[PDB]
Design a protein around this ligand. Structure first.
Ligand SMILES: OC[C@H]1O[C@@H](O[C@@H]2[C@@H](CO)O[C@](O)(CO)[C@H]2O)[C@H](O)[C@@H](O)[C@H]1O
Ligand SMILES: OC[C@H]1O[C@@H](O[C@@H]2[C@@H](CO)O[C@](O)(CO)[C@H]2O)[C@H](O)[C@@H](O)[C@H]1O
Lengths: 162, 162
């Protein structure tokens, strides 16, 4: 089951944080579905698992990212021996979708974070904020700041040629 | 004229950077008008000047901020002896206006930045980006990130009671 699964209302249409999650996988179990949500970025924090999309089978580990986009038919399953933990951010909006088309990550939907990547700290920080989300303390502003930082970081580290 | 006056298109309606500017005042000169723009925050980087609004006359210096909001009848004039330089960010959107109403700044429209304030480096950084604005290098994402940071910093340092 899920250590964290915060679902937010879809009140913004340029940029919206839809949900933030942490899941420790159960060995040999996962998910097989057509993605309904706009976009969901997963960061693998430990263990191993497999991501299956368009006939390709990726063996992923700590440091790896995979992104689910609306309409993708996907399967992602924790390793029997050493099941992954992943953090995820679900997001949407017209700006979000324009910025995703500026990164090479949306071609294969998988990447590996370099040693000094800014992406892991942003995703971990959004999940931390989500645990005690308080809009009256302006956590809503902070999550949006962090989502703009995340998409900037994806384009910096995984650019499409100009 | 102005050291910098970058005007942006109004493409976003939840959160939008309208313009960024730097102006070195000429002694005893400035502006007297009804504000048409949504919101414009000014940060005084050098010198002295006066801000007149709603019968009150404020003598401002380095560290001070004043905010122009749509419909305010205002006058702001550089000191005869030591004329101010100010940096300004013009912004708009439904989210921007909701966040401004979580700050105590929007009644008097004047404040002083504390020694450790995060506000000065955000405003200076937005103006620096504006000098060589390149959307193809995703400067548009970075300006929006910085505007969310600015509004978060205003609420943190100038909160309305909860
Ligand atoms: O959205 C990311 C999360 O997705 C969860 O899987 C859900 C599946 C089956 O329960 O059905 C959806 O609701 C379809 O939208 C999915 O969100 C995973 O269990 C999470 O681990 C996480 O990947
Ligand atoms: O918006 C902030 C800037 O305002 C400029 O003043 C302009 C006056 C000119 O009388 O008319 C407007 O266009 C009406 O919206 C103003 O923007 C100042 O010259 C700048 O220094 C800056 O404060």
């Amino acid at each position: 089951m899920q250590i964290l699964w915060k679902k937010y209302v879809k009140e913004n249409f340029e940029m919206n944080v839809d949900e933030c999650g942490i899941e420790q996988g159960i060995p040999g179990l996962g998910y097989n579905y057509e993605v309904l949500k706009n976009a969901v970025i997963h960061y693998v924090t430990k263990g191993y698992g497999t991501f299956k999309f368009n006939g390709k089978v990726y063996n992923l580990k700590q440091g790896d990212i995979f992104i689910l986009l609306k309409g993708m038919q996907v399967e992602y399953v924790a390793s029997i021996d050493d099941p992954w933990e992943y953090y995820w951010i679900g997001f949407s909006g017209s700006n979000a979708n324009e910025y995703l088309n500026r990164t090479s990550i949306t071609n294969s939907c998988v990447a590996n974070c370099e040693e000094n990547s800014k992406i892991p700290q942003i995703i971990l920080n959004m999940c931390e904020i989500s645990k005690t989300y308080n809009p009256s303390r302006s956590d809503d502003i902070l999550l949006l700041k962090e989502l703009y930082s995340l998409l900037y970081a994806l384009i910096e580290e995984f650019p499409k040629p100009f």
